Structure formats: structure tokens, C-alpha cells
Amino acid sequence: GLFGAIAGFIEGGWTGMIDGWYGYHHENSQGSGYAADKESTQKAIDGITNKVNSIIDKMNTQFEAVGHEFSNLERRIDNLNKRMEDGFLDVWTYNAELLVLLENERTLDLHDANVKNLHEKVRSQLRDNANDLGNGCFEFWHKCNNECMESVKNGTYDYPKYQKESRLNRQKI
């Protein structure tokens, strides 16, 4: 099902982020910018590429009709052949068309889950040093420079480092 991130609590996408599917936007004293998460984006590429290659690979064989001819005294054998050729045609037509529908659904849900997980992975670190705005954004209770932002992106944010400063802005507001 929907994991509620894409077109969910995160209402829209970013045309400003052009080096990846999943990523970050930050604002600090030096400015703002987009940055893709190279880990999760690459993992998504490997899975979906594998998914596409696996599907193509299972579609590798072909049923091959032929152009044999039949006399007017072979109507039955003629009809048998046709119903066979049409038979396997309807079967593979079905298998392909239905698989596309079902796996498109999975693929779209997959991105949603990956964004969802990434949002959690970040939320889990900042804890109460940041404000969860509910829209996929976090407001820091402290001063967070480029290196600070970097640690968050790389997953190495140091919570106790900024803990005291944060409480003071929550005891002054």
C-alpha cells in the first residue's frame, strides 16, 4: 500500500534535485541547496534494474506460429492450429499486460517506502534537537552549519553534541 510519503505528507517533488531520486534540502547561515542521498538512490537503481532485467529474462522465450497450409479437407486440423496460436497469444498477452499493471504498482510503492524509510532514518537521529513539522521538514533548535548538515546526510549526527544548546532554546521559547 501507500507508505504516505510521496504525494502524501510530503506534498510535492523537487525539480531542483537532479542527481538522484531521494534526497535533502537544507537551510543554514551559508545558504540553501539540494543533495541526493547516493546510498538509497543507488540501492533503488540496483533493485529496479534487477527487476526489469528479471522480467525481460522470463519473457525470453517465444511461442512461434508458422505458415503451414491446409486443404479444404483439413478444416479441423486448420482450426486446431489457429485456436492454438490464438491460445498462446492470449496467454502471453495476459501475462505481460497484467504483470506490468501489478509491478508498476509495486515499483511506485517501492519509491514511496524508500522515501518513507529515509525520513525515519533522519528523524530517528535528530530526536528532540529538531522540530518535526509533519511535512517532511525539520527545524533545528540550534545552529546547524554545513558540516552539521553533512553529518545528518551521512547519518553521523552527534545528538549529545547539540543537546544542551537545544534545551536552552526550548526553555526560552
Binding site: 506534498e11 517465444q62 511461442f63 508458422v66 497469444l89 508498476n104 529538531a130 511535512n135
Partner: protein
């Protein structure tokens, strides 16, 4: 200071269908089905097709006199048969196992034409003037180039004639013969004789003997007579004994036959052949793609993507595009 987590979006308008929603724009996708074709025939594995031109397939292997263009060894990748070919079985009668014959030749790669039974084989008879207005070449009468119409000598009668071919050779041999059925007793007496007449064919695996069915039949190319056409395979090692005292349409030129390692094809089409190469050739045209499915035709030679009825089969690889 703040940080946000978000997802990609771009200018894409390419759409896919899901089980829950249709026409959904995604950032990245891939079409799996090809629907484009070159309306022409090309070469398969550096081998040109054989165009039968204004000749049917029967007309070519029997040697219809108006198919002189095709009278040689033939080596093809696939065979293309033309929809409105005039030149087939010119002299009326039925070819036994016609459809099985097409299926055999279709699974063939190469045939070599040679003389099986020279006219000197048949001593005591008129090997010339065995000709008919029903098989014209230009104005005057002619006849099949692989078959010999044998009629009685004007001075004397038609004696037993004999032929033998031992296939000590490399490959299987495809040959053709017939039995002539005059329309009235007059021609039987005149061309062959009054007594009981027979056509005898025999190998290690075949036994063939027939007599004439003299009958008035509707006119076809001015002919109330008929000839029953026959074909068979003389296996390597086997030996053909031909014996007849009447009504024999003898084998004359035949074909050494080569089995194709894979399956071959015979297309019925008006499409122009050109000087081009194809990895996969359909009866409707050429496909050039890396895609996995096709839209154009179920009948093809080479390596084509799977044929389905779909108009589009597009996998989404990117994500829901929300600018």
C-alpha cells in the same frame, strides 16, 4: 535553520498504468514493446531470400516453362511466395500431398538441381513431342522442365521402358512423377496403346503401381484430360526402379535436398525485397529494436521480440512525478 527530505521530479510527461490508477506520470520508465517496422524483406545471416516472382511454389519445383528464371540450384534464408502468381500447375490435375510438400521445402535450406533420368534411359519411345498447349511458353506449346511426357512411337508401339537410380549420394533426393489420364479411349490408343497399361515405381520403402482412369473432365486450359502428380523422397542408400508400359510422366530433373538446422519460413506477400540486412524478418516487415515484445506480426524468421496484442507495455522505473 532547517532540513527537509524530498524526492525527485522533472519535466517528464511519459505515463504508465497501474492496477489502482491509469495515466500516471512517472519520472522514468521503459517501453518493452516495439510497434515499428520496415515494410520490406532483407537478408538473414548474409543470405538473400528466394523470390518466386510470378511463379507459385508448385510451379517452381515442377519447372513450369514460364519459370525459366528460377531454373537452377536455389539457396535461400527464407522463401517468399507471391499472392497473384500465374505460373503454377499449368496442365490440369492434382498434386498429391501438396501441403506436406510445402512444409518440407519450407524446412529446407538449399536444393541442387540435377538430371535423374536422362532421355536415353527410356529406350524405344518418343521422348520428344510430349508437349501441350496447356503449358505454353510464349506462343507454342511447352511443358514442365523436371518432367518428361513420354508417348508412343509413331511407327510402332510403346514397349516396356525401365529406369533405375541408386542414391549412393550424399543427400536425400526430391523427385516428381505422374500418371497421365487421357479424356477418351482414342488418345489412350494413339498415345500409349489399347491393352492394359501400368506405371510402376519402387524403392526399399515405397511400392507404387497405377492404371489410367480415362474420363471426360471439364475443360481446363483446353484439356479434358488429367495427370496425377506425385512427389517423394529417395533416401540415401535407397534405389528407385521405374517401370512402365503406358501413361508415365517420368522424372527427369530432380533435387538434392538439404535440411535446415533450424526452422525456415515461407511468406505470402507483396512487399518489395531490398538490399538490406535484418536480424529478424517478419512477413509484414523488418524489426530493429532491443525491446522484448513486438506488435507487428506472429510470423517471422530470425530472432524477434515476443508477439502480443498490446499497444503498449511500459514499466515504470522512476517514481510518481509531482512538480
Amino acid at each position: 535553520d532547517k532540513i527537509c527530505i524530498g524526492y525527485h521530479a522533472n519535466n517528464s510527461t511519459t505515463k504508465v498504468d497501474t492496477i489502482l490508477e491509469k495515466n500516471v506520470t512517472v519520472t522514468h520508465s521503459v517501453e518493452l514493446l516495439e510497434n515499428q517496422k520496415e515494410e520490406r524483406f532483407c537478408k538473414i545471416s548474409n543470405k538473400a531470400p528466394l523470390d518466386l516472382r510470378d511463379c507459385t511454389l508448385e510451379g517452381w519445383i515442377l519447372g513450369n516453362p514460364r519459370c525459366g528464371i528460377l531454373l537452377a540450384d536455389q539457396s535461400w534464408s527464407y522463401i517468399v511466395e507471391r499472392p497473384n502468381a500465374r505460373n503454377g500447375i499449368c496442365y490440369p490435375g492434382t498434386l498429391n500431398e501438396a501441403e506436406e510438400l510445402k512444409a518440407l521445402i519450407g524446412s529446407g535450406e538449399r536444393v541442387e538441381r540435377f538430371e535423374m533420368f536422362p532421355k536415353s534411359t527410356w529406350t524405344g519411345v518418343n521422348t520428344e513431342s510430349g508437349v501441350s498447349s496447356a503449358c505454353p511458353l510464349g506462343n507454342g506449346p511447352s511443358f514442365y522442365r523436371n518432367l518428361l511426357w513420354i508417348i508412343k512411337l509413331k511407327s510402332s508401339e510403346y514397349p516396356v521402358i525401365r529406369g533405375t537410380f541408386n542414391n549412393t549420394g550424399d543427400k536425400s533426393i526430391l523427385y516428381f512423377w505422374g500418371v497421365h489420364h487421357p479424356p477418351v479411349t482414342t488418345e489412350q490408343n494413339a498415345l500409349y496403346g489399347s491393352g492394359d497399361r501400368y506405371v510402376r515405381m519402387g524403392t526399399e520403402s515405397m511400392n507404387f503401381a497405377r492404371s489410367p482412369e480415362i474420363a471426360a473432365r471439364p475443360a481446363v486450359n483446353g484439356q479434358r484430360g488429367r495427370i496425377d502428380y506425385f512427389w517423394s523422397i529417395l533416401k540415401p542408400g535407397e534405389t528407385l526402379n521405374v517401370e512402365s508400359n503406358g501413361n508415365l510422366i517420368a522424372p527427369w530433373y530432380a533435387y538434392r535436398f538439404v535440411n535446415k538446422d533450424s526452422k525456415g519460413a515461407i511468406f505470402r506477400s507483396n512487399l518489395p525485397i531490398e538490399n538490406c540486412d535484418a536480424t529478424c524478418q517478419t512477413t509484414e516487415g523488418v524489426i530493429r529494436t532491443n525491446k522484448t515484445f513486438q506488435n507487428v506480426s506472429p510470423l517471422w524468421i530470425g530472432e524477434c521480440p515476443k508477439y502480443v496484442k498490446s499497444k503498449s507495455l511500459r514499466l515504470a522505473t522512476g517514481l510518481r512525478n509531482v512538480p
